[PDB]
Amino acid sequence: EAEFLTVKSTKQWTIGTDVQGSERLNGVSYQEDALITYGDYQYVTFYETAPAGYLNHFVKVGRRRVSPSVGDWEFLTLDDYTQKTMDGHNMISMGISGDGKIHLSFDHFDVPINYRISKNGIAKDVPSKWTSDLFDPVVHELVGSQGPYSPLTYPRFEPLGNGDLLLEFRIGQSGSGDSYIHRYSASTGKWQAYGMYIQGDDNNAYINGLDYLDGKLYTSWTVRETPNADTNHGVYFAYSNDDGKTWFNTNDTKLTKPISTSDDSTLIWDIPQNSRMVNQEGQLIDTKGRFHILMRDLLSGEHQYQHYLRKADGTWTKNAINPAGLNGPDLYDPRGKLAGDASGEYLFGILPDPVKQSTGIYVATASKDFKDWKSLAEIPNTSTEPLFDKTRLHESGILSVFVRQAGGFPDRKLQVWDFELDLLEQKLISEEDLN
Ligand SMILES: C[C@@H]1O[C@@H](O[C@H]2[C@H](O)[C@@H](O)[C@H](O)O[C@@H]2C(=O)O)[C@H](O)[C@H](O)[C@H]1O
Ligand SMILES: *[C@@H]1O[C@H](CO)[C@@H](O)[C@H](O)[C@H]1NC(C)=O
């Protein structure tokens, strides 16, 4: 008896034409999140150019039934708010709370918060007409909470276990910024300020994501000294037992309410500046409470993706991810993600190849200490930082990935790729070959 995680089927949809420009303006590493399943429906958000004709860029939201059968994508366009900042840093983050309300935050680079929410719980009480008037107008504050809401970059949403939704983001800028958390009550529709949880000391933290399991909130970050990406140093870790009010390091030592970038009690690996480690890559809490970080560095003597593992007993390991035919990325190459199956035995590396203009779905196993990376699938013709649907992977065993293609405008499309997983038990029965 042995078990193998397998891809039963592979399908794709082209959900739009990518926006014109030199910069990547869809499918970017720090989007949290872009593709979300809530009950029977999958939701996606991305920027599209206005159909008439080229100046205006709008937030677009798709939904499709994914249960109990997969239906067609349909779209609404939020054509009341044109995007002021179409540079590298302004991508959409989307979240869905336990009252079925859909939250959007977008169009940020050191500007005041941009936020909007559905009038109603449209993911719980599902409307049949999918139109832009489902969403309230854009606001620059969080009702019931307090700023500072400026200068804001990188809205990240994290659904908690009780229907509530965290919103996290940087205030200040590159090489001088603080990180704040706000909590939405699904129960009241009010935000409360959890305040500054990381204080920059003439630098800023860049978090890899927010992960939640059994009452515990996990995060990991590097520290950036200046606006130049070469000036990232350190891989840090902390977790909260009260959804981001109170924080503890890997040794379970409680921390000062604002964590300082200067305090190395949170440091879990020494990575100096100019190690070619990029900010805002990937992390994961697997369903067995093991914590993962995806970064990269050239420290081994080669540029390679690095897997940091925090084994449940507080002990850390670092192991390069070098499966056959994966080109190791440099500082400015597309950033990847880690996903986990419901069982918690199978770890997926969703790793864009820096040369091949494709994204690899690699799998490793807890049994073999996550050192057994196998190529399981490949998304071809991508120039993207892959983003996936953690809810749909957990509750349907389907790995659903938002990608931006490689190539020029207008050939370059936005797509969703669905890899139907099949965990196979193998019985090998010895049988008679005798006369
Ligand atoms: C590596 C780079 O980091 C973030 O963008 C930075 C960027 O380094 C630079 O223009 C300046 O530092 O502004 C940005 C900032 O204030 O954060 C983003 O993660 C980019 O996608 C990434 O390329
Ligand atoms: C605290 O954590 C670091 C790893 O982050 C480790 O090197 C050190 O041994 C730990 N110290 C204590 C007192 O547990």
Residue numbers in the entry: -3 to 431
What does the paper say about this structure?
In this study, GA-specific l-rhamnose-α-1,4-d-glucuronate lyase from the fungus Fusarium oxysporum 12S (FoRham1) was cloned and characterized. The results described previously indicated that FoRham1 was an l-rhamnose-α-1,4-d-glucuronic acid lyase. The structure of FoRham1 comprises a seven-bladed β-propeller domain, and the Rha–GlcA is bound to the cleft at the center of the anterior side. The active site of FoRham1 is located on the usual anterior surface of the β-propeller fold.
Activities of His105 mutants (H105A and H105F) were also significantly reduced, highlighting its possible catalytic support function. Therefore, we used the H105F mutant to obtain the complex structure with Rha–GlcA. The Rha–GlcA complex crystals were prepared using an inactive H105F mutant (described later). The Rha–GlcA (H105F) structure forms intermolecular interactions between a crystallographic symmetry pair through the C-terminal tag region. The ligand-binding mode of the Rha–GlcA complex of the H105F mutant was similar to that of the Rha complex, although the positions of Tyr26, His85, Phe105 (His105), and Tyr150 differed slightly. The GlcA residue of Rha–GlcA adopts a distorted 1E conformation (Cremer–Pople parameter: ϕ = 249.7°, θ = 111.3°, and Q = 0.619), which is clearly different from the stable 4C1 conformation in solution. The Arg166 side chain forms bifurcated hydrogen bonds as well as charge interaction with the carboxylic group of GlcA. His85 is located near the C-5 atom of GlcA, suggesting its catalytic role as the proton acceptor (discussed later). O-1 of GlcA at subsite +1 interacts with the side chain of Ser170 and the carboxyl group of the Pro223 main chain, and the O-3 atom formed a hydrogen bond with Arg220. Therefore, this conformational distortion of GlcA at subsite +1 is caused by hydrogen bonding with these residues, notably Arg220.
